[PDB]
Amino acid sequence: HSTAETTLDSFFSRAGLVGEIDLPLEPNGYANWDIDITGYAQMRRKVELFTYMRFDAEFTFVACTPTGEVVPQLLQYMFVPPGAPKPDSRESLAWQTATNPSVFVKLSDPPAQVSVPFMSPASAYQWFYDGYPTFGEHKQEKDLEYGACPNNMMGTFSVRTVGTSKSKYPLVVRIYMRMKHVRAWIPRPMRNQNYLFKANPNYAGNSIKPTGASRTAITTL
């Protein structure tokens, strides 16, 4: 007798492919990866099964050439917490502020992994904030006030090569993510129609489709 496969921590604690970063030779020389539990274009449906969630998360970084060759470069992965500024350019102070944690690994070394705790001011994450941001009561402008609770901002990941002179090796940096210690709450019915946008559950009203397959008739097989 065993129902452990059906636990949240057995239903979510798997390292997935979330980020694909290209660092070519011949765009500007750096990249900043806004953390989104999506990306793994399957996790959104698996998550919006519930409404309120809570978790610690483990990130893993796989770095190589497009060839797959392993080359002696020294990378810099930097976690930039919410509210904190993003790196303006390659030489901004955001790399040195040191408040923003930094991970310095080579590629000859195995993938660097670091854990990230639950980072919301709220007691738990939300995938739905039916209402308007703090504090909506003036003029419209509108294009920001939907399904977005910026209190759910998980931070960003940034990479260098590192400086000062640009690298010689073409690079791709794979970012893998896994949740731990998960706790969900009030359950949502699972999505049935195709996604269109991030951070809002809109749908294509022109093309509504039945949830599952269909038959020719009820009395037939």
């Binding site: 409404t51 904030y129 039916d130 504090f135 509108k142 006030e145 019915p189 009203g205």
Partner: protein, 236 residues
């Protein structure tokens, strides 16, 4: 099976108690005694009876959004504009009245954080968002557009995971759900954060022989529970 005598404060309803009466989430509404980490007694506690929405043969459903439904109308509504922080429970009581000669099941259900979505189209453009008059509809409510996906890409087939009670005019003509306060914060603004949204969806559509009143009403009567407010603002 029983006669009706139900009243509070000043208001007075006429309900029943012959079948299953009340469904809760597994938790009664309460107060709070925390560090954040007013208690209106016998005034807020009145059965605000919404406007009875009709129900044609070819309807698809309706949905109200608490606490917006009442927030701009009523004594309770008063204590929402002047205050900024909000927390409460609710005694929702939906009752539709029809003969034994009518028929048509309804689905009373509460979906917290009912973020809605409208159709992309119009001009050839790609993105659009619902006006203030659809995310915060108010007492009149709003008859939704695409039921099967609840205007949210969410199949009704699985809505029963939330507190629900079936209304089949064969057996029962009354539905009563009690909903506690559900949020990541023990307190939030009543103006800009509509919590759970009640919704009524007919699955078996109403049918009848003709010349038999094609319109049976839907009486919504609701009452707050364990309401609580904190800081207040000045009046206009």
């Amino acid at each position: 099976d029983r006669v009706a005598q139900l009243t509070i404060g000043n208001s007075t309803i006429t309900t029943q108690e012959a079948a299953n009466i009340i469904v809760g989430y597994g938790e009664w509404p309460s107060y709070c005694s925390d560090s954040d980490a007013t208690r209106p007694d016998v005034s807020v506690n009145r059965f605000y009876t919404l406007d009875t929405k009709l129900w044609e043969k070819s309807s698809k459903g309706w949905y109200w959004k608490f606490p917006d439904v009442l927030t701009e109308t009523g004594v309770f509504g008063q204590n929402a504009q002047f205050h900024y922080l909000y927390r409460s429970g609710f005694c929702i009581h939906v009752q539709c009245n029809a003969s034994k000669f009518h028929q048509g099941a309804l689905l009373v259900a509460v979906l917290p954080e009912y973020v809605i979505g409208t159709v992309a189209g119009g001009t050839g453009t790609e993105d659009s968002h619902p006006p203030y008059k659809q995310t915060q509809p108010g007492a009149d409510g709003f008859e939704l557009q695409h039921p099967y996906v609840l205007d949210a890409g969410i199949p009704i087939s699985q809505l029963t995971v939330c507190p629900h009670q079936w209304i089949n005019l064969r057996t029962n003509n009354c539905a009563t759900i009690i909903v506690p306060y559900i949020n990541a914060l023990p307190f939030d603004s009543a103006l800009n954060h509509c919590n759970f949204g009640l919704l009524v969806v007919p699955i078996s559509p109403l049918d009848y022989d003709q010349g038999a009143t094609p319109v049976i009403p839907i009486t919504i009567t609701l009452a707050p529970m364990c309401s609580e407010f904190a800081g207040l603002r000045q009046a206009v």
